[PDB]
Amino acid sequence: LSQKPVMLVIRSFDVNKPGTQFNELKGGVIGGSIIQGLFKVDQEIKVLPGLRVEKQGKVSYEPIFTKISSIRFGDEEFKEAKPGGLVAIGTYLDPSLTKADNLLGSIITLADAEVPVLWNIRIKYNLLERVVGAKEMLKVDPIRAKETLMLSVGSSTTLGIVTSVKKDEIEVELRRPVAVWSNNIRTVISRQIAGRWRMIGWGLVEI
Amino acid sequence: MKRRPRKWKKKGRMRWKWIKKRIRRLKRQRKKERGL
RNA sequence: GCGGGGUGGAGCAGCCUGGUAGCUCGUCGGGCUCAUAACCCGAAGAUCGUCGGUUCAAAUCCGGCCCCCGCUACCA
RNA sequence: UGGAGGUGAUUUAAAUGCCA
RNA sequence: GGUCGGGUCGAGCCUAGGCUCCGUGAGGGGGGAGAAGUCGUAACAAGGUAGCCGUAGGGGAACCUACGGCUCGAUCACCUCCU
RNA sequence: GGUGGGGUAACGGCCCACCAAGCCGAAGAUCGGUACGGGCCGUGAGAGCGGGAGCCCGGAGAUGGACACUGAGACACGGGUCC
Ligand SMILES: [Mg+2]
Ligand SMILES: [Mg+2]
Ligand SMILES: [Mg+2]
Ligand SMILES: [Mg+2]
Ligand SMILES: [Mg+2]
Ligand SMILES: [Mg+2]
Ligand SMILES: [Mg+2]
Ligand SMILES: [Mg+2]
């Protein structure tokens, strides 16, 4: 419980049933598990990346403050989520921000805390040995850049392209920033195979 | 674009307006496209 | 719990309202242009899964059987 | 003698062509 | 001549420092030339909707619409200006 | 650039201590790129254009880089040291 409590989300939904009156209205539920730290109902927090907005003519996001409306694992009553299991955290936000798995792989930490966001990300990557998950296993090629590859950041994900392809690391340009609580967090690279994006290396994010 | 008006004559080529517009879609690119 | 079509090479039209598989892409061939494609028209073409019932009489109304099987008990 | 300017009008469906 | 001190000019070496001198080298986007491959008809006449320039938006491709300008645009009706 | 000084055969920021803000620059500063210069040769109607190995008067190197001895004469091609 030393680094910043981060819940690396996997699900996010809206409790409000179709036809719910404006009196028992709820925020959204956002659901992960507490690996570093512990989260609590009514706590100040910021979610990342969350919301994207047009600020000065380019593309960028907004880390979003709130507090928790309740915490639960299903159907029992508790109030402060400790480590262990996908915990569900219902918040004070808008629900339309959360439905349809918009922020799949969200991250939650404190609205007074530190997790960075970078359009250009440097990642030390290790090549995979063969085409694992497929019928057919062909050689792993040393490539040049400009190819478009899928980079999944822990529970986050993005596309990426590059201009300097160093031997061991990669300087990838994106369209959406990262959720990187500290060093060498596990973001994985997959290359298209026949519409199936399979592994071509495991990388760790240096910042 | 520092016009050179020998090209509009449309003789053995294509219109000029609709070539300018397409060169923009590549200069805007090699400027944006990892030309950073 | 069920429940649906049970249709030509292909869209299946058409089913209580009952006699002409009903047009449409496609296959043969005939017309127009110089010649092609578009365009025009004859021909092929299944005959309603199938055993039946009801029905003077049928996919037309009702059932045996079976083809394929399409919806059966999620919001922190 | 020939223009030199202006206002209006100005019509279904009609694709393409080896060889010296 | 020698040896100790002090001072003096000075190559090389050596850390670290970006610059320029490169054998290469990893995906690339175009580019020039082959016009019995494939897709369509925008350009030339009033080219079957007139064309062509500046900005903007869209589009499997040549291309299409939106306001402001010129004849390097053809006829009928009608004027008006001069010779 | 100035005052005042040591130094070489000799004047000189050539070097030294003091004193102040001067110097050049789009009539092309600086930095990059190429070349040994001058008598002259090649061509051309002439106006030019292009070349300046071979002969003579200049200027510089002695495997790269540094430094001294001797003599009028230089840091010495067939003399001397160090890297
Ligand atoms: Mg001209
Ligand atoms: Mg024909
Ligand atoms: Mg028409
Ligand atoms: Mg045309
Ligand atoms: Mg036209
Ligand atoms: Mg004008
Ligand atoms: Mg003096
Ligand atoms: Mg120079």
CA distances (Å), origin A22, targets A13, A92, A101 = 18, 15, 23
Q: Does A161 touch chain B (CB under 8 A)?
A: yes
CA-to-C1' span, B13 to E34 (A): 20
Q: What was the experiment behind these coordinates?
A: cryo-EM
Task: Output the 3-class SS for chain B.
Answer: CCCCCCCCCCCCCCCCHHHHHHHHHHHHHHHHCCCC
Q: Which class in CATH covers the domain with range A1-114?
A: mainly beta
For residue A25 the two structure tokens come to: 């209205």
The answer to whether domain A115-207 has CATH 2.40.30.10 is: yes
In contact, A68 and A38? CB cutoff 8 Å: no
Which of A67, A61, A31 lies closest to A46 in space, CA to CA? A67
3-class DSSP state for residue A191? strand
Residue A77 dihedral angles phi and psi, to the nearest 5°: -100, 110
Measured torsion, CA atoms of residues A165, B33, A177, A126, in degrees rounded to the nearest 10: -20
Q: How many CA atoms lie within 13 A of A69 on its CB side?
A: 17
- Tell me how far apart the alpha carbons of residues A152 and A146 are, in angstroms, rounded to a whole number: 18
Which of A42, A168, A203, A186 lies closest to A105 in space, CA to CA? A186
AA letter at A53? V
CA distances (Å), origin A10, targets A14, A45, A72, A156, A200 = 14, 17, 15, 9, 23
Q: Which chain B residue shows the shortest CA-CA distance from A174?
A: B34
* DSSP code for A78: B
- Tell me how far apart the alpha carbons of residues A164 and A150 are, in angstroms, rounded to a whole number: 17
Cross-strand pairs, A112: none
Cross-strand pairs, A119: none
- Burial of residue A173, with CB atoms counted within 10 A of its CB: 0-12 exposed, 13-18 middle, 19 or more buried: middle
- Tell me how far apart the alpha carbons of residues A185 and A207 are, in angstroms, rounded to a whole number: 10
- Burial of residue A88, with CB atoms counted within 10 A of its CB: 0-12 exposed, 13-18 middle, 19 or more buried: buried
Residue A163: list chain B partners with CB under 8 A.
34, 36
For residue A12 the two structure tokens come to: 């996010």
Which residues 43-82 in chain A have a CB closer than 7 A to strand C?
Answer: 68-72, 74
In contact, A9 and A107? CB cutoff 8 Å: yes
Residue A166 CB coordination number (10 Å): 11
Q: Does A173 touch chain B (CB under 8 A)?
A: yes
Under 8 Å CB pairs connecting chains A and B tally to 8
Residue B8 alpha carbon to ligand 6 centre in Å: 20
Residue A175: list chain B partners with CB under 8 A.
none
AA letter at A72? R
Cα angle A141, A145, A149; round to 5: 80
* B7 Cα distance to chain centroid: 12
Residue A59: list chain B partners with CB under 8 A.
none
AA letter at A78? F
In contact, A178 and A121? CB cutoff 8 Å: yes
Query: Structure resolution in Å?
Result: 4.2
Q: Which chain B residue shows the shortest CA-CA distance from A172?
A: B34
| A89 sits within 7 Å of strand C by its CB | yes
Residues of chain A with CATH 2.40.30.10: 1-114, 115-207
